[PDB]
Design an enzyme around this catalytic site. Structure first.
Site, PDB file in Angstrom:
ATOM      1  N   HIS A 135       0.922  -1.103   0.023  1.00 44.91           N
ATOM      2  CA  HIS A 135      -0.107   0.212  -0.014  1.00 44.91           C
ATOM      3  C   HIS A 135       1.028   1.229  -0.034  1.00 44.91           C
ATOM      4  CE1 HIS A 135      -2.532   3.283   1.007  1.00 44.91           C
ATOM      5  NE2 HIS A 135      -3.671   2.374   1.637  1.00 44.91           N
ATOM      6  N   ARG A 393      11.699  -9.696  -7.657  1.00 45.98           N
ATOM      7  CA  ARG A 393      11.902  -8.919  -9.046  1.00 45.98           C
ATOM      8  C   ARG A 393      12.676  -7.951  -8.943  1.00 45.98           C
ATOM      9  NH1 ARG A 393       7.932  -4.010  -9.383  1.00 45.98           N
ATOM     10  NH2 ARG A 393       7.956  -3.385 -11.643  1.00 45.98           N
ATOM     11  N   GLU A 503       7.249  -3.445 -20.347  1.00 46.23           N
ATOM     12  CA  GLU A 503       6.568  -2.313 -19.675  1.00 46.23           C
ATOM     13  C   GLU A 503       6.778  -1.027 -20.456  1.00 46.23           C
ATOM     14  OE1 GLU A 503       9.215  -3.085 -16.401  1.00 46.23           O
ATOM     15  OE2 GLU A 503       9.390  -0.722 -16.224  1.00 46.23           O
ATOM     16  N   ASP A 540       3.076   1.062 -16.979  1.00 50.04           N
ATOM     17  CA  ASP A 540       4.362   1.759 -17.211  1.00 50.04           C
ATOM     18  C   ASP A 540       4.342   2.180 -18.562  1.00 50.04           C
ATOM     19  OD1 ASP A 540       6.274   2.191 -14.971  1.00 50.04           O
ATOM     20  OD2 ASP A 540       5.582   0.056 -14.680  1.00 50.04           O
ATOM     21  N   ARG A 578      -0.594  -3.772 -12.315  1.00 47.89           N
ATOM     22  CA  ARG A 578      -1.266  -2.831 -11.697  1.00 47.89           C
ATOM     23  C   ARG A 578      -2.166  -2.146 -12.390  1.00 47.89           C
ATOM     24  NH1 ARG A 578       3.752  -0.606 -11.386  1.00 47.89           N
ATOM     25  NH2 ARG A 578       5.610  -1.744 -10.586  1.00 47.89           N
ATOM     26  N   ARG A 703       8.248   6.680 -11.458  1.00 46.47           N
ATOM     27  CA  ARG A 703       7.560   5.532 -11.653  1.00 46.47           C
ATOM     28  C   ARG A 703       6.148   5.653 -11.814  1.00 46.47           C
ATOM     29  NH1 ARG A 703      10.964   6.608  -7.241  1.00 46.47           N
ATOM     30  NH2 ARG A 703      13.176   5.764  -7.930  1.00 46.47           N
TER      31      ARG A 703
END
Ligand code: ASP
Ligand code: ASP
EC number: 4.1.1.31
Lengths: 873, 873
Positions: A135, A393, A503, A540, A578, A703
């Site tokens: 979160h 990752r 991405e 992304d 996401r 990001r």
């Protein structure tokens, strides 16, 4: 009729209001009431009350800021809980009602040209895996999950008409207690949370909701199969699995070192022992049966043959208690030989538990078998030993550097200079090599060592603790082969699923080329064992080229990969990142899962649940059931009834839409000279980095999260819409508006894409956006501001026009209504946050000290605003 | 309208019935259905189906017995849970509705000649102490309290109209699970339970019901005082205390040795640590407040001055965890020095907890203070360190023998031969003596050593672990002085309350003489510190002289003692034994507490809760609230509005009633030559001693419990009515029937006495009584049988006549109805038990082996029958 919802929010606000009255003031309540009135006024055109608002905020003393902010934040908090209660409440939206599953099942069943065996096989092949993520704005020191479960229970009980007044009085007494708790139980992290903290929040979600939720989901799902289709899945088949990235994702995060991962890996096992113990206690006492099968008695034979099921549970309790004890030592930093019966694999738990089930069934104790044991059997496979498998990752770039450094040390050359054909040559050579490569006692740089250490943790961990190795920024076939080389040097006994994460627009565009070359290498083909898993980075790529181009690029890449793997006989698994339309939750998500290229979920649903949406998707056990049920329906329907292939002219409208949209999006974000300066002024971007919000340490460098989040706080929502409408209006202007309307009517991909802008446009707020410019942006940048705002005004028209409506997200009245409520409650946090940012930003300008009151109030609004807006990307 | 109750029993019986169907047979369900039909028929006169019943039972194989018995027992079990649910359910009898308290309070308040300060003082002086006793027929190996709490929760949730069908389905699914549990989770003690086992059941009652119940009772009580009277008792005043006799009562029980008491004493402390830890965990996490008072900060000062309330809770957690650890070692038999912060006294818990409350209040956090902390504060004083204080109880006779043996060893003489004046002389001499008496290293007999060892445990235990020393069979002033001498020799630092237990007609009659002599000894007077506590043995005196004489004797003795102590300035505390009208529970008890000689509860309510009534009085937290609320109303009303003193002619009717009744009762029990032989045949008395029912080891020798219990199983209820009606009809026959009616109308003592026979007559059953004679008694004793049965038929008339009614317990329709339901459900256990007794008794006659199936079935009926009949004495 949303009356009950309106009643509940009013009630909760009255008790909260009472509590602040008691607490410390009527002054604060006046502050709060004045700000809303004044803000509502100002918005409705009153330019006299706009001045009054500005002076009112400037006159707030620093000792009023936090209480005021918390106040506003609490009211919003109560609204979401009223909203969420309503959703599962049977006399409201009823999210968890088992008809959700049955409606899907009935539709399938009475569809001609759909054999019953075809449907059965799709059921038997279901698979869901939800990856929890941190979160981004969790502001307190301890999780509040469990309190929330309680507030919701109190509301459930008050919902019963006919409740004796004394019971009502009792219920309200606890409710008051619980609200007072939150007003006074204030916790505010002073320092950046750590990967372990974030990993801990994930255990809170598991024990307060997933633990009950998964098995209930599995019970309901099973009742529905038997009722509608006539059969129940077998006990050994548990299609759901939860995974986490917390303490596994090092992408861009220095603080997630191999040490922390090792730790978190350990902690999960400690926690699974904690929860598994509670299950087994219950079983040790309730399984007092003495009738067992030959086979089960054999398994104990004498000693415990006079209390057989109790024997086996007693054994496991000890074995769990043993491994518990071991892990608390290791957690402490103490190394000590591991106990006789240390638990490492789910089979060690499954085995005995399944033994009891079988004899209980065999011996006529079916109802006891299918109760608490069944719940434990399913949690074994759903969570098991590790509790929640993790994913590792790291960026591709970091693997290159590790291997370059290695190769120059060995005098072999410099891997990060070789062409891509050379690297593959080098990698295939070494992958087949029986002689080691990693120097026995070496001295690399910090970075490289981290890369090397982490594969060592992977290798060291018990098989089944780690789900997959994700390569963010994967661009070529050598990127994937690289991690396989490193894992081999780290000594790994099993085949670890590696996944490229494309991405960017071009990576997305090259993705299918990258995988056919990989699949053409015979060595690679035999190492994956007929299974590949790709990761699509919608969020992304959207930062790269805008949402329309991103969306179309993703559509095309999945379609190509599905096809390539089908040819090649590889079971593809698309891993979703996401946000996007797949991370919308609820009905929209079901729509979105169904609007993907045919083939798309043949290899299951694997998704990255966004951090800020966990409360809303898995916050309570019944919401969990809803969420899993929704998804399950989407899988079966998508696999048995795929969408139609697009008409060729549609594909050409998408290409062009994609080009115009990317063109306009980069025009501003990259090309425009005023943007960056604008961006850092109008949004709280800089302060999102400084404050202690995520575990990562305090436009191309940013990001997705920070991009998306910063624009959501500002209320303009820039990232989720920018060039889409502009390109759409232009295509309308060529008279292709009726093709746009057919695409929307007949192509799921397209309505879904259009759907999603509406929701974004529904939460955006141009009055507030302009308010931040007026308080925070220098006069010369105001023009850009209005320009971007007018862009949006014009984009809603075209979208509304293509959609043939006048309201905005008109097919979803509950979601529309819920957005309307939160929007009014979020209102004042945005009004206050502008004052905070201005106070905070002038202190620094005046080379001053960060006042803790101003920063803490700022942290509350950021979290408030994020909570009210939910998904905005 | 008892429709809802009727629905619920039907429902539960259908699911139970389903479960047996699944379980193992339709055959058993037929067995069950045939027995009821056949038994109902037989009763309604059909003498053909009486033969059929007799052959049906004789044909049951031993493998059918237990399942059949359990079956019948389960149905009864479901009926009581339906019955108990109904009682607290707001749309039913509503036992726990706070109006119970308010009705008492309003009545007092608007009563002229009752100053408000008089009422306030009675409130501030309330005091209740409930002494838990063992359950005589607890047949299983583990407590089922918690399961019961769950079955009742499921019923609560199903009671909500408007429950979405899916929720209903879910609820029924658990309900089915829970019922299956009990059908298959069969446990049957094979061996006599032990004092520790019985002590353990008492901890089950404390954690599953008293723990929540007392504080809720205290909250409701407090809300009511403020609403109706305008003030709330202070936080430091907790008028309720729970005590146990389990592992404290050695009266007639060899197995309760000083060792066991020592153990149980230890275990309680272990358990209080267990429950106190849960409370403190909650507090350690919820008390995140940082604002504290000068005083509270002082108490921590630095170190934890940045998390003050959390500091103090953290300290206590450790301190609790320390003493926990210590006690598990001691429990294990390991002696090891005791930790720095070992907990021994409630003040050690109270102190810190109270510190938080004060600052929380002081600092504006009232609502947090009055929540979970308040609940913990009250449990501290209600249960505290020892969890449940114990009472020690030994016969007077055993103290005499200990002291005789001592004195002959010392060459001083033989105490058990000296006149009573000599013994007092000897005892006062030694009580004042500074030189010891107990030989350093002595060699007494087992018995004497036990007496000596137990006072050593008393002395050894931390002050406040033991509530009192009860002397069963107290006959003279030397009996009380004796235990004081022994306690002094055992080295005791504090004054231990000693209580004579007068439990015979003559002891009752001499009681006031015994205490005035005791109060005349100046030494004794100064040692009790203005406080004496007597114990009235209604139940045993009733075994002595019948209930009417017993009752009147008790009335007279309490009236005399109240008066004597008042003169003398001693605060008397009457300790009530088992059963009688005070142990009726509910409304009748409130009536009964109020019908005692004025003065009677000035020194509080101290009662012996009967073992078999705990489920019905404290079985669930809401029933606890009801029970404590009922009692509290009775105390205040009895203290502010005492009953009138009896008219002199009433006293003379009672004397004569008392004489005739005692005369007829002894005529049969003692004088009649056929009784004993009758008694051992018609009731299961002998088998109640052999089977593993109580912890005591396998007419004057018998004890009340076994007397009462044996006659209840037989259904004649002999002990609770015998000479009462006979004497009453005789007084009617002198034309004093209208005085009898005035006594009933105007003298609470008398209506209460008459009330109580009705209930007994309501549960008695002459068809069954006669059935046992026919199956179990030899033909020559049949006449006595009919004689006693006809005695009862005639006694109901006279009672009904005096009461001016035709139904039986007509002023209590709910209780009447509930008795009616249980009576039908108990019916077949009695029908089956006669077959068991006959099978069991012929095996022994045929010098055979006790078949375990026949004994276990027998144990089920005994417990079933006892459960359906509740209080019968
Ligand atoms: N998840 C909703 C918005 C919300 O509930 O906040 C949507 O995608 O429209
Ligand atoms: N306690 C009730 C009887 C019962 O409920 O079993 C009475 O004294 O009448």
């Amino acid at each position: 009729q949303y009356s009950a919802l309106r009643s509940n929010v009013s009630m909760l606000g009255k008790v909260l209001g009472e509590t602040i009255k008691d607490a410390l003031g009527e002054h604060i309540l006046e502050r709060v009431e004045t700000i809303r009135k004044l803000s509502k006024s100002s918005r409705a055109g009153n330019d006299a009350n706009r001045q009054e608002l500005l002076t009112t905020l400037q006159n707030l003393s620093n000792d009023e800021l936090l209480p005021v902010a918390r106040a506003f934040s609490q009211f919003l908090n109560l609204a979401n809980t009223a909203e969420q209660y309503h959703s599962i409440s049977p006399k409201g939206e009823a999210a968890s009602n088992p008809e959700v599953i049955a409606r899907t099942l009935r539709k399938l069943k009475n569809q001609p040209e759909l054999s019953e065996d075809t449907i059965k096989k799709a059921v038997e092949s279901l698979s869901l895996e939800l990856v929890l993520t941190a979160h981004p704005t969790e502001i307190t020191r301890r999780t509040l999950i469990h309190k929330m479960v309680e507030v919701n229970a109190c509301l459930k009980q008050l919902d019963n008409k006919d409740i004796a007044d004394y019971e009502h009085n009792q219920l309200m007494r606890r409710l008051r207690q619980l609200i007072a708790q939150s007003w006074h139980t204030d916790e505010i992290r002073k320092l950046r949370p750590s990967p372990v903290d974030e990993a801990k929040w994930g255990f809170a979600v598991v024990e307060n909701s997933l633990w009950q939720g998964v098995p209930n989901y599995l019970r309901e799902l099973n009742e529905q199969l038997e009722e509608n289709l006539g059969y129940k899945l077998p006990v050994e088949f548990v299609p759901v699995r939860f995974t986490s990235w917390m303490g596994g994702d090092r992408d861009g995060n220095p603080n997630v070192t191999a040490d922390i991962t090792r730790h978190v890996l350990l902690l999960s096992r400690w926690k699974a022992t904690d929860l598994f113990l509670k299950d087994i206690q219950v079983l040790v006492s309730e399984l007092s049966m003495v009738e067992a099968t030959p086979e089960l008695l054999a398994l104990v034979g004498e000693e415990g043959a006079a209390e057989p099921y109790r024997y086996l549970m007693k054994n496991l309790r000890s074995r769990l208690m043993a491994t518990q004890a071991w892990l608390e030592a290791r957690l402490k930093g103490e190394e000590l030989p591991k106990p006789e019966g240390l638990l490492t694999q789910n089979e060690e738990l499954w085995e005995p538990l399944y033994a009891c089930y079988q004899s209980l069934q065999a011996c006529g104790m079916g109802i006891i078998a299918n109760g608490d044991l069944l719940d434990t059997l399913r949690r074994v496979k759903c969570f098991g030993v590790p509790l929640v498998r993790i994913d590792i990752r790291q960026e591709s770039t970091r693997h290159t550097e590790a291997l370059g450094e290695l190769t120059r040390y060995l005098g072999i050359g410099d891997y990060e200079s070789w062409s891509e054909a050379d690297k593959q040559a080098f990698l295939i050579r070494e992958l087949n090599s029986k002689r080691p490569l990693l120097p026995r006692n070496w001295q690399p740089s910090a970075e490289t060592r981290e890369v090397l250490d982490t594969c060592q943790v992977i290798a060291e961990a018990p098989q089944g603790s780690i789900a997959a190795y994700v390569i963010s920024m994967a661009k070529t076939p050598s990127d994937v082969l690289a991690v396989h080389l490193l894992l081999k040097e780290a000594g790994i006994g099993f085949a670890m699923p590696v996944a490229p994460l494309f991405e960017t627009l071009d990576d997305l565009n090259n993705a299918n080329d990258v995988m056919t070359q990989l699949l053409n290498i015979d060595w690679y083909r035999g190492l994956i064992q007929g299974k590949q898993m790709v990761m699509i980075g919608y969020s992304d790529s959207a930062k790269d080229a805008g949402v329309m181009a991103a969306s179309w690029a993703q559509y095309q890449a999945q379609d190509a990969l599905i096809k390539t793997c089908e040819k090649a006989g590889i079971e593809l698994t698309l891993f979703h990142g996401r946000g996007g339309s797949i991370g919308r939750g609820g009905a929209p998500a079901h729509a979105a899962l169904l609007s993907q290229p045919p083939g798309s979920l043949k290899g299951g649903l694997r998704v990255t649940e966004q951090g800020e949406m966990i409360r809303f998707k898995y916050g309570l056990p019944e919401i969990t059931v809803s969420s899993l049920s929704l998804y399950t329906g989407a899988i079966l329907e998508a696999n048995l009834l795929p969408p139609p292939e697009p008409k060729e002219s549609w594909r050409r409208i998408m290409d062009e839409l994609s080009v115009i949209s990317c063109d306009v999006y980069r025009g501003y974000v990259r090309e425009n000279k005023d943007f960056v300066p604008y961006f850092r002024s109008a949004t709280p971007e800089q302060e999102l980095g400084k404050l202690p919000l995520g575990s990562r340490p305090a436009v191309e460098s940013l990001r997705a999260i920070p991009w998306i989040f910063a624009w959501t706080q500002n209320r303009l929502m820039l990232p989720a819409w920018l060039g889409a409408g502009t390109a759409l209006q232009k295509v309308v202007e060529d008279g292709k508006q009726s093709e746009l309307e057919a695409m929307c009517r007949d192509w799921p991909f397209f309505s879904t894409r259009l759907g999603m802008l509406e929701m974004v446009f529904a939460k955006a707020d141009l009055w507030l956006a302009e308010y931040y410019d007026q308080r925070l942006v220098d006069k010369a940048l105001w023009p850009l501001g209005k320009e971007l705002r007018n862009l949006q005004e014009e984009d809603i028209k075209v979208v509304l026009a293509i959609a043939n409506d006048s309201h905005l997200m008109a097919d979803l009245p509950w979601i529309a209504e819920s957005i309307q409520l939160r929007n009014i409650y979020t209102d004042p946090l945005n009004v206050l946050q502008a004052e905070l940012l201005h106070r905070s930003r002038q202190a620094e300008k005046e080379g001053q000290e960060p006042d803790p009151r101003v920063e803490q109030a700022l942290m509350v609004t950021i979290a408030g605003i994020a909570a009210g807006m939910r998904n905005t990307g």
